Design an enzyme around this catalytic site. Structure first.
Site, short mmCIF file in Angstrom:
data_model
loop_
_atom_site.label_atom_id
_atom_site.label_comp_id
_atom_site.label_asym_id
_atom_site.label_seq_id
_atom_site.Cartn_x
_atom_site.Cartn_y
_atom_site.Cartn_z
N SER A 13 -7.21 7.78 10.43
CA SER A 13 -7.67 6.88 10.19
C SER A 13 -7.54 5.65 11.56
O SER A 13 -8.19 5.10 11.33
CB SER A 13 -6.57 6.20 9.09
OG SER A 13 -5.02 6.80 9.40
N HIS A 66 -6.61 5.45 5.15
CA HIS A 66 -5.75 5.94 5.18
C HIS A 66 -5.74 7.81 5.53
O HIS A 66 -7.08 8.10 4.90
CB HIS A 66 -5.35 6.35 4.45
CG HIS A 66 -5.10 7.29 3.22
ND1 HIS A 66 -5.15 8.08 2.75
CD2 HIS A 66 -6.32 6.60 2.29
CE1 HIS A 66 -5.33 8.28 1.63
NE2 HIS A 66 -6.41 8.41 1.17
N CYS A 67 -5.01 7.85 6.63
CA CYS A 67 -5.48 9.71 6.34
C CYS A 67 -3.64 10.34 6.11
O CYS A 67 -2.91 9.83 4.49
CB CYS A 67 -5.98 10.30 7.70
SG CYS A 67 -5.05 9.75 8.97
N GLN A 68 -2.97 10.85 6.81
CA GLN A 68 -1.92 11.02 6.22
C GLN A 68 -0.71 10.40 7.87
O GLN A 68 -0.67 9.38 8.26
CB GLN A 68 -1.17 12.00 6.38
CG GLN A 68 -2.28 14.12 5.69
CD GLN A 68 -2.14 15.09 5.79
OE1 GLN A 68 -2.58 16.10 6.34
NE2 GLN A 68 -1.29 15.26 4.27
#
Ligand SMILES: CCCc1scc2c1-c1nc(SCC(=O)C(C)(C)C)ncc1CC2
EC number: 3.1.3.16
Length: 150
Positions: free
Chosen positions: A99, A91-93
């Site tokens: 990701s 995950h990132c944002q």
């Protein structure tokens, strides 16, 4: 309240954003034991509970960020989750630009898909993906290195 979408790209490989990564119940329901956090500033969610194995790829969403340098380290972590039958969440944002790049690279190398087919495959399951031309260029160079065996 946020409805956590943890997208299964593969049965053991999940993709999400920052709010998806904060749902502990969904993660345990999906048998996830590994988390890759592709940000410099987000916390490692649920760290203090001692439930998951973590790996941080401290990358930004900039047009000069190098993600290729982290590919092999991420693949080794994914392979460890695969071999013990556990799920991994990367995950990132919000736009999952960081990701989704690593997910696509994994599909290119370990599922032997082309860059285009891997993108289309991920895009079909996770419709909202923010474009990053820098990361796209790195995936294109990654495809050529794979096609040359380098
Ligand atoms: C990976 C190849 C992306 C390609 S190949 C042809 C097209 C696109 C494409 N991708 C995106 S979002 C994907 C990303 O940029 C990452 C995951 C690197 C963050 N938005 C629009 C287009 C337009 C058409």
């Amino acid at each position: 309240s946020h409805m956590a979408e943890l997208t299964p790209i593969l049965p053991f490989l999940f993709l999400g954003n920052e709010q998806d990564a904060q749902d502990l119940d969904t993660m345990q329901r999906l048998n996830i034991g590994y988390v890759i956090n592709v940000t410099t500033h987000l916390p490692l969610y649920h760290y203090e509970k001692g439930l998951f194995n973590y790996k941080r790829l401290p990358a930004t969403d900039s047009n000069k960020q190098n993600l290729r340098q982290y590919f092999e380290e991420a693949f080794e972590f994914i392979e460890e989750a695969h071999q013990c039958g556990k799920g991994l969440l990367i995950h990132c944002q919000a736009g999952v630009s960081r990701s989704a790049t690593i997910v696509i690279a994994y599909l290119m190398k370990h599922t032997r898909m082309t860059m285009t087919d891997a993108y289309k495959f991920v895009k079909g399951k996770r419709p909202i993906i923010s474009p990053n031309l820098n990361f796209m260029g790195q995936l294109l160079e990654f495809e050529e290195d794979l096609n040359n065996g380098v």
